[PDB]
Amino acid sequence: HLMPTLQGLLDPESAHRLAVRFTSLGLLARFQDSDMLEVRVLGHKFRNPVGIAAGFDKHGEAVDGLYKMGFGFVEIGSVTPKPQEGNPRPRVFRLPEDQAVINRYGFNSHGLSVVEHRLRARQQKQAKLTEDGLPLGVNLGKNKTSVDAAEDYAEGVRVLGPLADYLVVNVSSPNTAGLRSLQGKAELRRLLTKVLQERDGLRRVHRPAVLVKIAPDLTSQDKEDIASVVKELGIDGLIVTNTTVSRPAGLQGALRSETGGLSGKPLRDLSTQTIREMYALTQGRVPIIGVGGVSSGQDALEKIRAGASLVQLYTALTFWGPPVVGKVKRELEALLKEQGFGGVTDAIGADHRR
Numbered sequence: 001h002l003m004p005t006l007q008g009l010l011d012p013e014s015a016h017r018l019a020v021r022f023t024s025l026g027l028l029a030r031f032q033d034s035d036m037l038e039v040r041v042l043g044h045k046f047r048n049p050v051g052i053a054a055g056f057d058k059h060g061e062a063v064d065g066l067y068k069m070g071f072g073f074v075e076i077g078s079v080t081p082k083p084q085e086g087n088p089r090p091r092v093f094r095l096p097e098d099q100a101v102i103n104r105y106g107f108n109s110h111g112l113s114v115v116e117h118r119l120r121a122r123q124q125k126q127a128k129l130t131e132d133g134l135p136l137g138v139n140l141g142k143n144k145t146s147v148d149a150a151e152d153y154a155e156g157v158r159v160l161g162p163l164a165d166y167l168v169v170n171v172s173s174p175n176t177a178g179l180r181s182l183q184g185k186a187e188l189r190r191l192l193t194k195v196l197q198e199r200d201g202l203r204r205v206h207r208p209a210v211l212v213k214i215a216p217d218l219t220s221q222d223k224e225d226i227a228s229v230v231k232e233l234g235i236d237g238l239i240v241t242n243t244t245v246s247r248p249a250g251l252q253g254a255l256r257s258e259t260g261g262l263s264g265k266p267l268r269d270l271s272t273q274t275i276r277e278m279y280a281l282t283q284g285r286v287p288i289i290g291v292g293g294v295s296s297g298q299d300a301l302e303k304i305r306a307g308a309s310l311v312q313l314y315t316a317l318t319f320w321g322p323p324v325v326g327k328v329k330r331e332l333e334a335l336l337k338e339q340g341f342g343g344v345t346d347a348i349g350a351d352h353r354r
């Protein structure tokens with residue numbers, strides 16, 4: 001009621017900005033996480049497997065409010081090396097009839113320096129949160145006018161790697177020209193070699209896991225190549241998936257033909273299937289964070305059974321608000337019991353074993 005009014009009254013970008021402000025100020029979880037929901041992966045304990053996806057808190061302003069909302073882990077970003085404004089407005093669109101969003105933000109970012117200082121101000125608070133099962137991820141992007149993509153990512157590793165439990169090499173935004181070509185075998189191998197070199201140069205207690213975030217629009221060859229490179233280099237994990245440049249048949253929203261990445265329900269099963277493929281291609285040995293269209297416990301469990309160790313959501317929050325977090329968790333716990341799993345861990349990749 002208070003949300004859909006403010007959102008019927010505000011364009012989506014204004015609604016987002018207000019949501020970040022409200023969350024950051026702690027104006028918002030009764031659900032107490034069961035032991036069944038704990039997952040150990042990426043060198044950390046996660047008190048529950050439901051995280052906030054990149055894009056909600058691009059600049060690291062609302063991290064504590066997000067844990068208060070009940071997220072088991074928080075991912076901020078994408079952060080670019082230099083500040084940049086992103087695309088001109090309007091650049092985000094609701095498709096309410098589809099429970100979907102289309103965005104073309106183009107990596108609006110306060111930049112590494114601003115985010116560094118913001119995280120440093122709460123660095124020991126985060127260390128305690130991480131030890132308590134509430135890790136922090138930092139998602140790295142590249143500036144629009146950058147003439148060396150790998151150096152942009154390297155800079156991100158150097159500056160924010162020491163403040164993160166995991167880093168994400170985001171090579172799958174549909175809204176930065178040329179970016180998704182970095183998912184190609186040769187480009188990815190070169191980029192990730194550099195990224196891992198830089199990460200390995202950080203002092204041990206400041207050395208994050210490194211994950212690569214991939215698109216839902218990849219060819220079979222692209223997926224096979226990514227799997228090969230991830231295994232060759234010892235990449236720590238995959239985030240599967242970013243938004244889709246596809247427009248599935250059946251979309252009803254008036255704004256369905258806006259340029260950008262599509263998120264929410266129409267992406268859900270395309271993302272699940274991409275998780276399934278990547279888990280198989282990596283022999284279940286590479287942790288996957290599953291994302292795209294999660295709005296229920298069933299949605300979460302489907303991705304977990306397909307191979308995700310953790311899941312994330314964003315678009316569901318924009319429709320259902322903060323209560324969706326607890327809802328997903330409570331539903332997930334109930335389904336795990338119904339399906340005879342002792343916990344989340346037992347369900348990871350379960351579809352591949354039946």
Ligand SMILES: Cc1cc2nc3c(=O)[nH]c(=O)nc-3n(C[C@H](O)[C@H](O)[C@H](O)COP(=O)(O)O)c2cc1C
Binds near residue numbers: 054055105170241
């Ligand atoms: C408004 C918006 C902005 C986003 N910005 C980013 C971003 O900066 N970096 C990133 O890796 N993913 C970004 N994403 C993608 C989400 O992290 C996620 O992969 C995708 O939206 C699918 O999950 P969902 O269906 O739960 O929203 C963004 C998504 C939305 C809706």
Ligand SMILES: Cc1cc(O)n2nc(SCc3cc(Cl)ccc3Cl)nc2n1
Binds near residue numbers: 013018056
């Ligand atoms: C791009 C976009 C649009 C949007 O309505 N939302 N909503 C959220 S979180 C939901 C929310 C909305 C308002 Cl208006 C106030 C508080 C909260 Cl938590 N994030 C968003 N991101």
Ligand SMILES: O=C(O)c1cc(=O)[nH]c(=O)[nH]1
Binds near residue numbers: 170175261
């Ligand atoms: O900044 C954006 O446009 C953006 C980045 C990204 O990775 N994914 C997305 O959907 N939007």
Ligand SMILES: [Cl-]
Binds near residue numbers: 162163206
């Ligand atoms: Cl440091």
